[PDB]
Every structure is written in structure tokens, then in C-alpha cells.
């Protein structure tokens, strides 16, 4: 819901994170896909130097 | 006019609070449920003019001593004010014993530990949210 | 905002922590997992200018420094300023002979391998991530 991660997740993030989320939904991802595609590029970028 | 859009979070206060909770834990405080959250509420209560806001800072910021002072084991405000003149006629080398003795480096270094951990997650996560329902459940605890 | 810009990671310092973690593993080391985690967090602090954080950094190596000389079982300075007369009585032959049985050139080795490892790794694994994670675990261990 997008109300537990605005209220969990600082705007900025949040706004992020549900942009990502809308790039794979309009390319026919999907929810569980997309949700769980967010979740392997948050666990990537923590632990994978990606920048 | 409008009140939710001043709902910005405690901020400062948070972390102040998080010394508080450390401690709790530690045991070197006793906790007081109703003045941390009557503070707390206070601070929250949204305040449209910034000048409000400013001087709620300024007024809390003696208040928070205070009751920084209260909430520990140390005598209260009272017995110090009454006995200053005792405290600056000591010697200052005791009196520097004195506070190392009741500095706990330990104590500090959790602090700072801790004042790193909450400023790197300020910028992922809500801590206000968190902070008020570690609140809620010390309320509920001391209920039950 | 963007304040991801100003959390510049550990940097050089993980090799530093990754050498006590080994030197920790062998048993040559007295770890006081606290001020470690202090260290850690006062260099992962973020500071809106480079200016700061490199003067921060050149202010911690010798804070670094004093850390790796208290954390290794070596004698404080106070006694190599006692016994500098001592020191300066000995040949220069025998110093030679005295530094050389002290090093321990299989650590020499464990370092370099240990640099290259640091070198190629840093590219492909945040070891910042895992030095803090074990930093924290230690400090878990040795409090709880």
C-alpha cells in the first residue's frame, strides 16, 4: 500500500522506490515481480558497489 | 487554516529522546512514561507561525534541561540551587574528580554510536514513527 | 535531500579495521570493541565539505594511530621515554638483530595478500557493509 510506505519511508525515497515500481508495471511486470525485483535491487545496492 | 501539513516529525528531539531510551536499557534512568510523552505532545502539537515554532525551541530547551535533570537520580533542581555556593566554594580539582567519576566514557561512546546510527537513518526511514510506538508500548507495558 | 552524497564510506580506513580484525583472529591483538565501533562512526559521520572531511581524516590518523598502539600488547610511551637511555646504549648491531627477530615477516605477508585482496575487492563488495556488520557483532558478543 502506498500509504504504509509513505508513512514507514521518508517522501523522497518513497517517491523513488514507487517510481521504480510504476517502470516495471508499465512494461508488464508483474505486482509480485515488480515488488520483488525492488527488493533484490535494495539487498544489490546495500551489499553490490553499484555506484 | 490547515494543521497536518506541520506534522514534521520530533527532529532533534528524537535523538534527545533516544538518549533517553538508551538509558532505559542501561537502567540509569527512571523512566517516567507521562511527562516524556506530555513533552512529547508538546512538541508535536503543530504551530502554523514559524515564530511559534522558534519559540517553543527556546522555552523547551531549559524545559528539556529540567526535566533532563528531574527524570535522572540527581537531587532535584532545589537542592542544587540551594547549596551552588557550597558547590563553587570546593575545590575545583575535587569537583573535576568528582564529574569524571560520574562520567561514563562508556556511556558517551554509546551515545555518539547511537547519535550516528539515527542521523544515517534519518534519511530512510521514518523515526518519529518509531520513536512514538516504542513510546506507546512503554505506556502500555507500564499499564499492564 | 540528497545527503547519500555526503556518506563517503569508510574509505582507506576498511583496510585499517580488516588488518585488527585479522591481527584479532591470531590473538595479537586486545580489542576493546567500543572505541572500535566509536572510531568507526566518527569516520562514517557525514560533512557537507570536503575541506572538513579531509581535515577530519588527517586529524583521526594519529587518533587511528593511538588506537592500533593501545589495542597491540607493545608498552606504553611513558616507558620508551624512560628507557630511551637504555635504547640508545645498545649497539646498533644489536637493534638490528632485536628488530628483526621481532618481525614476523609471515604477518608481512598476511598484510600484502590482505591489501590485494582489500584492492580487488572494494570493487566488487562493500566492505564497509560487512566491516560495520562484524564491528556490531563483536560489540553484541562482548556486551551480551
Not at chain 1, 508513512?7 to 516495471?24: E, F, K, M, S
Not at chain 2, 533516544?18 to 508538546?42: I, Q
Not at chain 2, 546510527?117 to 502500555?140: D, H, K
Request: charged share 10%; net charge positive.
Amino acid at each position: 500500500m502506498s500509504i504504509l510506505t509513505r508513512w514507514l519511508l521518508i517522501p523522497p525515497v518513497n517517491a523513488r522506490l514507487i517510481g521504480r515500481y510504476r517502470d516495471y508495471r508499465r512494461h508488464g511486470a508483474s505486482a509480485f515481480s515488480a515488488t520483488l525485483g525492488c527488493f533484490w535491487m535494495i539487498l544489490a545496492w546495500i551489499f553490490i558497489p553499484l555506484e | 487554516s490547515s494543521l497536518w501539513q506541520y506534522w514534521r516529525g520530533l527532529s532533534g528531539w528524537n535523538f534527545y529522546f533516544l538518549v533517553k531510551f538508551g538509558l532505559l536499557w542501561a537502567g540509569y534512568l527512571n523512566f517516567h512514561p507521562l511527562l516524556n510523552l506530555v513533552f512529547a505532545a508538546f512538541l508535536l502539537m503543530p504551530l502554523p507561525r514559524y515564530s511559534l515554532h522558534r519559540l517553543r525551541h527556546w522555552i523547551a530547551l531549559p524545559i528539556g534541561f529540567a526535566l533532563f535533570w528531574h527524570d535522572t537520580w540527581l537531587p532535584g533542581p532545589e537542592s542544587i540551587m540551594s547549596q551552588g555556593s557550597q558547590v563553587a566554594g570546593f575545590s575545583t580539582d575535587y569537583l573535576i574528580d568528582l564529574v569524571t567519576r560520574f562520567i561514563n566514557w562508556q556511556m558517551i561512546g554509546a551515545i555518539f554510536v547511537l547519535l550516528v546510527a539515527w542521523l544515517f537513518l534519518s534519511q530512510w526511514i521514518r523515526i518519529t514513527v518509531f520513536v512514538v510506538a516504542i513510546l506507546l508500548w512503554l505506556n502500555v507495558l507500564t499499564l499492564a
